[PDB]
């Protein structure tokens, strides 16, 4: 078995170099991570210590912030 988390949506800010992704695991979360990894909406992946297995490839994900999902904050991100 392996956890199957799904990216509900993602926003990338050019002002910064950050990717904000709302994802579902066992609950909704917002992750602020490095833009280098691109996670389009609908992507299913397995989390790992400082990494993500997507399509059987382990990408090193640099995480800035992990927080519970907020409808207001996510809508604010999507409006930029």
């Amino acid at each position: 078995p392996h956890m199957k988390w799904i990216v509900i949506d993602t926003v990338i800010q050019p002002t910064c170099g950050i990717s904000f992704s709302a994802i579902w695991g066992n609950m909704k979360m917002i992750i602020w991570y490095q833009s280098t990894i691109f996670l389009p909406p609908g992507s299913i992946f397995t989390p790992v210590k400082s990494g993500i297995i997507l399509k059987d490839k382990e990408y090193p994900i640099t995480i800035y912030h992990i927080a519970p999902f907020n409808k207001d904050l996510w809508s604010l991100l999507k409006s930029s």
Partner: protein, 328 residues
């Protein structure tokens, strides 16, 4: 019991045993339940009456439960919809989550207590924002050992504006003397228009890594937010400070956030400034009020100032840094 008294609840499930289980669980809690066995029947029931909460299964429906969600959102009813699926159709769960759904449950019914948790959280979100509070605490502890504060600090240092720049045909210079490359006092300058310029100053040494995050979030949205407050006008920086407090609250960014916010209009030769936490001075000299940092006091509710000059020199200092800003 009597928790769900007067709670109209719609259950759109296709397997009869699961229908009965859900109805018995909801009626045990006192809910007024309406059950459908078909997607079209679901659409009709919806056109008929408005349930306080809805449950739909996209598993073997006559009409895709995700398509029923699509219809509901197209109508804009935006009624709650808790979906039922399994470890399969991960993409369907994604599509549901993109729709205005609330949570998800695996087809087996084993964890009824988590079902009670989700149903109550949906039906009385204000009452059961205890869940949100607990999750805030959990994620505050969680973030500590999964995130890389060093990388965020380095990114914030890299994103700082150039020392000398012309914005809105205003000359702008800034010089910091506290130890650089260890992100302390942080600045952002943006152009709101061909004549309007704005900027914010935050001492990220007080909130720690969260402060860095806050700074980044500010650089993402500050411009936007200020523009929104300028949308409903022919100023009012304080509302922007409170909205920033609420932003840091929405994100899991606790702590003290000493901030300064300024806005200069070139053709009106006017500078407006407000401070919550940071010391500063600026000329014709005026010392900006210290203020109470954000994330505290609930709402700082502080003052502004208009000097009506063409060029200004404002020094901004806090316990984490000292900086000078200049407009000619």
């Amino acid at each position: 019991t009597q928790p769900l008294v007067g709670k109209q609840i719609l259950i759109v499930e296709d397997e009869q045993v699961f229908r009965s289980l859900l109805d018995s669980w909801f009626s045990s809690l006192g809910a007024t339940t309406v059950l459908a066995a078909d997607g079209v029947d679901a659409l009709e029931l919806l056109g008929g009456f408005t349930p306080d909460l809805m449950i739909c299964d996209i598993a073997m429906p006559r009409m895709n439960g995700l398509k029923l969600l699509e219809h509901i959102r197209n109508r804009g009813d935006q009624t709650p919809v808790l979906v039922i699926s399994a470890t399969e159709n991960m993409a369907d769960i994604a599509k549901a989550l993109r729709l205005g759904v609330e949570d998800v449950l695996l087809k087996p019914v084993k964890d009824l207590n988590r079902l009670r948790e989700m149903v109550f959280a949906c039906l009385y979100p204000s009452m059961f924002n205890s869940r949100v509070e607990e999750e805030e605490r959990l994620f505050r502890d969680w973030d500590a050992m999964v995130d890389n504060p060093a990388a965020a600090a380095k990114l914030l240092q890299e994103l700082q504006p150039p020392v000398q720049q012309v914005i809105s045909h205003c000359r702008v210079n800034y010089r910091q003397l506290v130890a650089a490359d260890k992100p302390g006092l942080v600045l952002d300058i943006a152009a709101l228009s061909e004549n309007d310029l704005a900027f914010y100053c935050l001492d990220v040494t007080r909130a720690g890594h969260n402060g860095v995050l806050a700074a980044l979030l500010l650089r993402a949205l500050f411009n936007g937010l200020l523009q929104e407050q300028l949308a409903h006008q022919n100023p009012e920086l304080g509302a922007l400070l409170k909205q920033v407090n609420h932003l840091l609250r929405q994100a899991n960014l606790p702590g003290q956030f000493p901030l300064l916010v300024g806005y200069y209009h070139r053709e009106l030769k006017n500078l407006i400034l407000v401070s919550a936490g940071l010391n500063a001075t600026l000329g014709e000299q005026v010392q900006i009020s210290n203020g109470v940092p954000l994330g505290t006091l609930g709402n700082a509710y502080l003052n502004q100032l208009s000097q009506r000059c063409d060029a200004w020199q404002c020094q901004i200092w806090g316990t984490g840094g000292r900086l000078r800003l200049m407009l000619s």
